[PDB]
Amino acid sequence: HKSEVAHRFKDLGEENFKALVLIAFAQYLQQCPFEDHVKLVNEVTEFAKTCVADESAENCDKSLHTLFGDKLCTVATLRETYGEMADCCAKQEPERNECFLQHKDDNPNLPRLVRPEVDVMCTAFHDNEETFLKKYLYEIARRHPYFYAPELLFFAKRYKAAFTECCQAADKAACLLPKLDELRDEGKASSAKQRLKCASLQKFGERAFKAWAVARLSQRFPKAEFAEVSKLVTDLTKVHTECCHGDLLECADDRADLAKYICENQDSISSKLKECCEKPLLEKSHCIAEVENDEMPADLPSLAADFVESKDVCKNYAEAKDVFLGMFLYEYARRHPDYSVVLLLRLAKTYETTLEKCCAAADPHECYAKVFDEFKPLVEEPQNLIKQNCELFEQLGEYKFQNALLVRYTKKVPQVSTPTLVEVSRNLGKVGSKCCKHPEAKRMPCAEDYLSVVLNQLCVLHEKTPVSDRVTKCCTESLVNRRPCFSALEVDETYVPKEFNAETFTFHADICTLSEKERQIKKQTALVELVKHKPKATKEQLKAVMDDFAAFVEKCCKADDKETCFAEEGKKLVAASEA
């Protein structure tokens, strides 16, 4: 249409318009102060209206990329503050915006945002949330310059919802802290999931991304015929591509295009999309990616007919192989929402290998007549692994559970950072606590999601500075093999325990006045070093020693005097436990 500026304002809404404009500028001009942006966001919302009023107002017919670009190159401290970047202004069109895109900083050099106190948070809220919420939005925006504007928008309107319901409450913190934490982790398990969709696209290939796409998409839209899922896949993949590139506009659009094709052919695709395609343009796509598994036609056969028995199997393969291996995955995938995508993938890898050896051969029919056998062991592993993993967690709490994982993944790899062996140890915890709260039916997919991010923030931290091969081997490995590879570590015979240095195992009264989280971390931390010291430690020598540090805290951080309770009663463990 006529002037893209009005098209956007009218259909997005002055409100949303500002939010996204704020974000968009904040994602590029990471250095400039919040107050600056506010001035931009109005100077622009004020201009925009000029078209929402008579779209043929000077400059309205310009392209948003030209507009966006033109006003960047208007900032002033552009060079003084950005430099290199000021140099895109002398370039051009297509080239000017692309130039700008190459200069946004993955890892910004700002401080960690401290989370102030419920009280000031509240007080500042009731107060003008405009700038309570816009500033914090601005803050998150610049620290994560690649996060999808509209989505960051959606988080925010929940962070808004959050203060709404707690700030006006009895005991505030109690209400909100949980929520806030929950919204926090929610965002990392989204930031990282967004940064993983891409690497995997660049590392393993377009074929791989598609494979995954057909899998996940079928499980979700099981009554959609293959050619449909197939069409939805090619689109996704492209969508997932221009988005990884990072051109927030082209990205947004595609997602909208694909968003509304689906909307316009739901009968072919799904039912459960009724209540999402009634949403406004901005959410259409998000709502959908989050839609819920559609139901199966139940009456559905068995993959045996089409993939083992017939004849022509070998022929239908050769005749264009991915189509085939795709169909295979489709069918297998749609009949098993309860499997995590990568598991259907080895099923595919497995099957693939099998032909490939089989159609090359004396008698294929009898050569592969029996793969489904090769599948059972694959499917059963993660099922046993989740079963007894959620069972162990049923006994011990999140806390006592981590501590299990803590010892376990230290003996298997005591080279790694202690703080790291602690971070991940817990993150795992939460995953247990999360996804064990589901039923078998939805257990595995849910783990793959999280486990897949956690079990990576762990790699990069290890890519930061290497410490093990095994950990580095399981990290170079394929997204498909990455998991088992970990679930297949054994405990480091080679090593020699760490070197007694006590200043460690010594706990001054500090631990009385600390918080729930911190107390546990100081405990878990020593929990590790201790294992790092006496690696061959038993599930019973430990349990004792641990029951000892207990009632030692109970102790010291209790009866009248503290402060040397710990100290005298302290050393009465240090050497004290050693047996």
Ligand SMILES: CCCCCCCCCCCCCC(=O)OC[C@@H](O)COP(=O)(O)OCC[N+](C)(C)C
């Ligand atoms: C409708 C607009 C309302 C205002 C929008 C901004 C509200 C957000 C308020 C944030 C206030 C708290 C800041 C803080 O201390 O948070 C710690 C954050 O770093 C946690 O960030 P998250 O929102 O969990 O992650 C969003 C960024 N991700 C998803 C790219 C990682």
Ligand SMILES: CCCCCCCCCCCCCC(=O)OC[C@@H](O)COP(=O)(O)OCC[N+](C)(C)C
């Ligand atoms: C030091 C790094 C630790 C790596 C973890 C080792 C690999 C296995 C970790 C066990 C998981 C413990 C957390 C938990 O309580 O959940 C149960 C998990 O075992 C379930 O995960 P999986 O069934 O492997 O997830 C399915 C992912 N698959 C299907 C692609 C393997």
Ligand SMILES: CCCCCCCCCCCCCC(=O)OC[C@@H](O)COP(=O)(O)OCC[N+](C)(C)C
């Ligand atoms: C060389 C040997 C020195 C021994 C001390 C050095 C490291 C100590 C090793 C234990 C590390 C802590 C283990 C852990 O992760 O949690 C332990 C806690 O659950 C202890 O229970 P608490 O509730 O703190 O104690 C309560 C006391 N009660 C149970 C008697 C009431």
Ligand SMILES: CCCCCCCCCCCCCC(=O)O
């Ligand atoms: C299997 C879910 C298919 C949903 C297709 C909706 C496509 C909208 C854009 C896709 C981006 C969302 C990423 C995701 O679904 O994980």
Ligand SMILES: CCCCCCCCCCCCCC(=O)O
């Ligand atoms: C001057 C800049 C105006 C910029 C407005 C950016 C608009 C983004 C609209 C995004 C529509 C997204 C649809 C989707 O994500 O599914």
Ligand SMILES: CCCCCCCCCCCCCC(=O)O
């Ligand atoms: C159109 C997609 C065809 C899917 C082919 C099924 C074979 C299993 C794929 C497993 C992931 C492959 C990883 C890789 O290619 O290195």
